[PDB]
Structure 1
Amino acid sequence: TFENMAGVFMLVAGGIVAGIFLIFIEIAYKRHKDAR
């Protein structure tokens, strides 16, 4: 409709993309630590 839902979508989208990036690098680090 207006800035309300668009802004909440932008917030959740930024959150989810940052989360997937950080979780990818953290999962790589965790795998490296487990398989040292």
Structure 2
Amino acid sequence: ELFFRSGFGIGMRKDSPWKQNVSLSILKSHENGFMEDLDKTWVRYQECDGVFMLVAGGIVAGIFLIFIEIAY
């Protein structure tokens, strides 16, 4: 069972001016089905894709018994 639940993320410096832009884009592509499209294409499916052997001796033993019976 899982015991450390925490997601991923894009890392950047503290003074990065692109932080607010990027969060909105992820949260806007997370609901219009884009994440499902990437999920199915890449990660989703990726399918993996003695006694009995002695019956020959038994026939020989039966033949030997047959030969003995024929002789006797």
Q: Say which one has the larger Rg.
A: 2
Scaled by the length of structure 1, the TM-score of the pair is 0.50
Scaled by the length of structure 2, the TM-score of the pair is 0.28
